[PDB]
Amino acid sequence: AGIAMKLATDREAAEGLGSHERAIKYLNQDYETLRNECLEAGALFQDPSFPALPSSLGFKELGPYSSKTRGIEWKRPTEICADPQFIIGGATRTDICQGALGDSWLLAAIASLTLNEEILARVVPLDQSFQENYAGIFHFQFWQYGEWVEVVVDDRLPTKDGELLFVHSAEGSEFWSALLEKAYAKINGCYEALSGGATTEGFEDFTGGIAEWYELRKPPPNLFKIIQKALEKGSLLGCSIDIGHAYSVTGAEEVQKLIRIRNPWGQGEFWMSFSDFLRHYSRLEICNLTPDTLTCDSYKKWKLTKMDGNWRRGSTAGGCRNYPNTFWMNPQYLIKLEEEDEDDEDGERGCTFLVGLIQKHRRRQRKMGEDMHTIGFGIYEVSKNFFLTERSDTFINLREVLNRFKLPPGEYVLVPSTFEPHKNGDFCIRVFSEKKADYQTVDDEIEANIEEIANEEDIGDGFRRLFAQLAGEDAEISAFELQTILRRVLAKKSDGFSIETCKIMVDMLDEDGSGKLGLKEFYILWTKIQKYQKIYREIDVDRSGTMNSYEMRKALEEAGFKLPCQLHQVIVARFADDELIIDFDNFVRCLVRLEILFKIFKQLDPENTGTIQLDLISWLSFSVL
Amino acid sequence: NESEEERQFRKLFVQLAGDDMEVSATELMNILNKVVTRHPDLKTDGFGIDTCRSMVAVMDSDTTGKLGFEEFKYLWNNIKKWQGIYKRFDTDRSGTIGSNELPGAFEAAGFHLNQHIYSMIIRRYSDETGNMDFDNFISCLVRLDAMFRAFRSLDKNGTGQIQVNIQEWLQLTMYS
């Protein structure tokens, strides 16, 4: 925990940890290890971090003491089938079904998977079985808000009267499907979490793709071309009718307008009018693959970019153009296209792209699609942009919000947010586009420009007597001597610098190396302090004795500093009180450490490499002193 | 499945935050200024807010100003050790440790540096009297702990060195 952790993880991700080739070991569990361990011991696997107990079932509908979970017998594949198989190839259809417990969104998600190898495999390692190095363990790979996470489960599946209570094929022989659902429950905390699920989400987590989705009631014009264009790129589509069986869409050719409709629980597809479509089905869901999903040598893929961000109450949580005091404070991004979508009818000048903003897991989300803020973004045509900032709107409260665009080449700025300001969250924005697009972050570069005041001859003759008559016997003031004095020029706006502050004050300007302030140094302090009161003065437009969090950005700039949004979050989280207020004592204390923390760096970094190198000892000293 | 203690606090958690399970500084300040401020088995007014804000910071990896329960649990556990090391060195039960005991109490605490650093830490957490109240003794150990944990996190391989760009340097030192 703490910052040093996120930083290590961050560095790890930048080395590829969390990419499909190097997925994150969920809970730090590794499949090969634990498997081998169980093999050396001639035991079958028993997962400690999601045992065959109530825990893994539910907390409310599927809770402990709940009758629905009373008298479940967890049993392993060998104990409900003579010959358990992981997966059979040839698969031309599906017969998965749901047990008496267990949401039916899994049907369609799993059904989509069983009709593309390259897909399935991306989430279900094929090298797996009951006949090879079997030890009652399996493993899967899910996509999680932008990165991949490998989850491991022991095979015991839940059953009442020897009937599987969840996802399970009707034949009764192939176990992979039931075992995938077990691991997905796992990374969501328990089966019951999967209760209200959406198929686009879990299908998103089974693929790494992005779901684009249309209430047929109110289709857009140009849909058929969208249908057709997805099928070329390779996207799984899925349609159905609202109360309820899921079908997909496998083709979309003119002759007339006509799209072919498959049903995986059949062995096969069938033609139907696009117009009849519109009329028999009520949803259409499209799921666009990342370009590294299929290895089709020229299948034309999406070009993908993604980035990660945060909102934090007090600094970065602004959002919605409805709130112009703060909207500009959200984190900003620049999307810049070049090759317009190539010609055919359309209309131009069309670089086509998908924008997705997904919201990362919050610590109270016990179940799918619950406690999901309202989120949204703006795009704008052409340093952090100010208040003087092309579709925007459509601010839904789903886990992911998405909008398809086609806009002229050039530069655009994306600003994602929540609808009302002040809500903490993380997010990932991905952009899939026809041609190479570019992404860059736009924010203030880090910059400490502090005016080098001084001291030169003169120095108030009043100054002079003043410090001597204050230093006492040594002609030096301590953080303490200093403490009380300032408390005097102070109470007579504020109730004194705290004692910690005082101390850092002294740390900054000591240099004598002695813990005490000479005459010259106590005049620098004093001028900086006066400088801090000025700045603090103006920001306190409202002349309230206090400053709101949201104003530090600006404050800090007048004090000669420019930071990026994450450093801004760290200041308000560390220097403000609930209610987003920063007292005058905090404020300067902040600004002093920040001056010191930059100094130490440029000095250890005199050639400006952009990085400094420290050994425990030197770390402990600088870092605390 | 956890020390009856932790599962009680937990109440104080669920009361204050619900399913969020997290706690502000000042909220968490209270909770601590209760188990340890009532008891005359130990002299101390209470933990400072500042002291308190730090506990949260070094243990917040999401930069939200909240201390998660799991993290709370790590903190408390060392907090109760460092309780051990406190009393064990506050002979006079003054509500301070006199200067000359600290370096024992510190080495006691698992952290072993030299004279040169203790001649600084002491010189920076003590009072004019050169003695460190409990507040300070704990606050320090909280830091030291986290700057040590920070380095391990940034040296996963073995070099006994870390290299930080500027953003890393200020995240790691401003949130501390």
UniProtKB/Swiss-Prot annotation, chain A:
Chain ranges of the Calpain catalytic domain: 44-290
Instruction: Give the region (Domain III) as residue ranges.
Output: 291-444
Please tell me in which tissues this protein is expressed: Ubiquitous.
Q: Identify the residues that bind Ca(2+) 7.
A: 540, 542, 544, 546, 551
Enumerate the propeptide ranges: 1-18
Q: How is its activity regulated?
A: Activated by 200-1000 micromolar concentrations of calcium and inhibited by calpastatin.
In what residue span(s) does the EF-hand domain sit? 497-530, 527-562, 592-625
Q: Which PROSITE patterns match?
A: CALPAIN_CAT, EF_HAND_1, EF_HAND_2, THIOL_PROTEASE_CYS
Effect recorded for residue 229 to E = 84% decrease in activity
**Name listed for the protein in its UniProt record:** Calpain-2 catalytic subunit
Organism of origin is Rattus norvegicus
Q: What is the lineage of its organism?
A: Eukaryota, Metazoa, Chordata, Craniata, Vertebrata
Swiss-Prot record, chain B:
Entry binding sites for Ca(2+) 4:
45, 133
GO CC annotation: what is one?
Answer: calpain complex
Question: Which residues hold Ca(2+) 3?
Answer: 90, 92, 94, 96, 101
Give residue ranges for domain EF-hand: 4-38, 47-80, 77-112, 113-141, 142-176
GO terms under biological process: protein catabolic process; proteolysis
Residues that hold Ca(2+) 2 according to the record: 60, 62, 64, 66, 71
What's in the keyword line of the UniProt record?
Acetylation, Calcium, Cell membrane, Cytoplasm, Membrane, Metal-binding, Phosphoprotein, Repeat
Query: Where does the record place it?
Result: Cytoplasm; Cell membrane
Q: Which residues form a coiled coil?
A: none
Where are residues bearing N6-acetyllysine located in the sequence? Answer: 87
Q: Name one GO molecular function term.
A: protein-containing complex binding
Q: Which parts of the sequence bind Ca(2+) 1?
A: 17, 20, 22, 27
What function does this protein fulfil? Regulatory subunit of the calcium-regulated non-lysosomal thiol-protease which catalyzes limited proteolysis of substrates involved in cytoskeletal remodeling and signal transduction. Essential for embryonic development.
Q: How does it assemble?
A: Homodimer or heterodimer of a large (catalytic) and a small (regulatory) subunit. In presence of calcium, the heterodimer dissociates.
Q: Copy the domain comment.
A: The contact of the 5th EF-hand domain from each monomer allows the formation of the homodimer and also appears to mediate the contact between the large catalytic subunit and small regulatory subunit for the formation of the heterodimer.
Any idea what this protein is called? Answer: Calpain small subunit 1
Q: Which residues of the full protein are shown?
A: 95 to 270 of 270
